[PDB]
Amino acid sequence: VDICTAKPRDIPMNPMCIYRSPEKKEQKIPEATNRRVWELSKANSRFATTFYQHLADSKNDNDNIFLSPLSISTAFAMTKLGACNDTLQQLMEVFKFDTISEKTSDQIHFFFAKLNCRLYRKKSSKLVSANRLFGDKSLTFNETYQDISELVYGAKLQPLDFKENAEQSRAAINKWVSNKTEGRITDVIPSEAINELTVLVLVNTILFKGLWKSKFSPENTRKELFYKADGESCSASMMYQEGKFRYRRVAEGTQVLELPFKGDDITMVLILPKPEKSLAKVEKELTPEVLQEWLDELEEMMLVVHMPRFRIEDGFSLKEQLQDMGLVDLFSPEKSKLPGIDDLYVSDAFHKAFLEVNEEGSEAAASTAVVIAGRSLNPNRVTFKANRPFLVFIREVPLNTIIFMGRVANPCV
Amino acid sequence: VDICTAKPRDIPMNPMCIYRSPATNRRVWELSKANSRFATTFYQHLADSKNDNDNIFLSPLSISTAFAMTKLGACNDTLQQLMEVFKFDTISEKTSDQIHFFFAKLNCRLYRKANKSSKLVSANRLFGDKSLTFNETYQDISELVYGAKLQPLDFKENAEQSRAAINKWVSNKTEGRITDVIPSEAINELTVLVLVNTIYFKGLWKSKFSPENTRKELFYKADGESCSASMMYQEGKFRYRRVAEGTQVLELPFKGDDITMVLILPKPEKSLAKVEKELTPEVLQEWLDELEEMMLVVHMPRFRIEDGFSLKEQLQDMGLVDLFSPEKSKLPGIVAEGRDDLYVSDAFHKAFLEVNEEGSEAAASTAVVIAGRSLPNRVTFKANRPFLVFIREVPLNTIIFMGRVANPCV
């Protein structure tokens, strides 16, 4: 009985410890696409967009960004497995799982079961989950929890010594993650983050590696000025190439470009607004249904792509924002209530996201040059030149899931 | 006896007229350079007459051959001009006849091999009138160095059943690819002889393409119209070299490594024009040396193009006049009695190329016509963003085929 065969009966949860979300007062549903995976992903996306807009304000327009809502959601989802009462009512409400009409907190875990099966299930374009919870090596760690936090989210409890080993912990951890993420994510937990008062700490991240299905050519990269959020400009390494790429021009000339990865199931979506418009307006106006709609109308088209190479690493302390967003009873010592594992609450949540884009894709560079003989394209054709701030997305199409999302507001070095 | 293994002193070849200019394998190599030089020169003269978006294809090897043959019965002045325009004079010895021997050695090292997957053959043939008497020295030697036999045909009354007669022989020696070397009305009652050459190629891609990864795609002609193509695609290690003003030189070897196709596309902005205008055997060689193996993506159209035309015009512009003159033409070694009103009415050429996922198939034929009609022929099939193509034999340094692919559209 594994993740890909689980039926609701294989994912039980303590009664008198359940939530019932309200009825939603239509359905782009494509071909053979499991509706439950579809519904869940819409909620993950609702959270992905919301969380992102709040994280945008708390940052400068010139700051880059990059996280993994899929990460954070599957994380706090794992934790939520043992939530209950007013604590749980908040995990649902805040991660929009409560927006999947009528669906009960116990079902949510069966959906993730379904999504997770299809998500991380293996040539190229590998996706890996690095989520795990950390609490003191003390009291009850209800086995039933783990037994499932193994089947569904694939990673057990894991108690540490927040006392005699409060330091070789914030290293036992950083060592774990940085191992799974094949060395990409290193300093998972910041400095002076773990001590004795540290009760529980949540750590989440993802590892995506893949090649552009239509690689750019090194021989074509050329330094170019990138106009930033302020007014200035700088030296960025602009990549160049042409070919069929799903595209679409939308509201007030904002460009939406899809570059796929080998496999086609994992793609990168760029959202570049016209020069006169600010990424700000776009970021704020970007709602789950607007974004969802935009992607729905992408048509294959021949065009000229100009996109800068860029690297982006980022660390987060989910706690403050999460709180500010409504999630609190989990971060409070007296208000907590996780009967799945007393006074046990979350001391902090840390996330690290990493993305480096070159002429080949995500994986290590190379020199693969491109030779296209016998091709003549229309002189009048679309042109997508990203020499100004744009959004980024790495989604899994068939599962309509936003894996990573970010903002490249300064690619230069 | 074997015309191949033979040595210089063994071959009896003792023509009618010898020309005097002002190490065998070292000479065969010098012939190839002579030929290669004729190929680029000739090619430019052929470009400098078409729209820079016009398709072009030919086998300069096929041409250099048919005329090497004609050179046999050639004499005084015409014998020299032939020695010049085909740069046979740039060969070691200052003795015409010597050439013919080296050319046969080359044809041995080319079409005569113990197999190699890459099929590469040649067939030659003379076609004389039913009522004439051909000089026996010519006929024996024509069939000695080129394996060119002399078959009869009624040119005096059945000029037409004759063309059809000849065209088919090529159609047979070129897998039905070249089926119309000689046009219509080009051979009449006064038609004396007709020298013909044919070369056929067909190799498999060493690194085959995938029919799966091929995609139909719109291609825009220079005009403004567009037609569907079919690009193939594959990633792999290849000899390549971004050079010049961003020109790309790519080599695509066939099963054997002895015969390779070299593509040459100029920077998207620029055009072939300045590339063609500078093409020479050394240039093309310079590039061939820089080619370092490299990991790279290859996008190539799965197409086929045919091309036909007359060698008269250009061959004249290049200095070959006498042979075409009903007066100055001197070909006394052909019609026994020593007849001397034999001149080349016209020379026709017809080539064929087809590139697909398995490999390519090239065929060409050249027909020299002595005293027939001297009629420009039919047109091509234009498009845009063109690129050069050469199918060459590397160990032998000879351009078998070459051209400018412009319109791949089917």
Ligand SMILES: *[C@H]1O[C@H](CO)[C@@H](O[C@@H]2O[C@H](CO)[C@@H](O)[C@H](O)[C@H]2NC(C)=O)[C@H](O)[C@H]1NC(C)=O
């Ligand atoms: C975590 O706590 C629960 C109690 O809520 C434990 O569940 C009990 O398990 C035993 C043995 O399977 C049963 O006899 C009880 O009936 C269960 N409780 C109820 C009311 O269902 C669970 O075993 C605990 N986990 C650990 C660490 O043992």
Ligand SMILES: *[C@@H]1O[C@H](CO)[C@@H](O)[C@H](O)[C@H]1NC(C)=O
């Ligand atoms: C709700 O919380 C109370 C304590 O506040 C706890 O005893 C109970 O099990 C929880 N669930 C229900 C349905 O009462």
Ligand SMILES: *[C@@H]1O[C@H](CO)[C@@H](O)[C@H](O)[C@H]1NC(C)=O
């Ligand atoms: C035939 O031509 C050869 C040289 O081409 C010459 O030796 C001979 O004199 C000629 N004899 C005839 C058949 O007229």
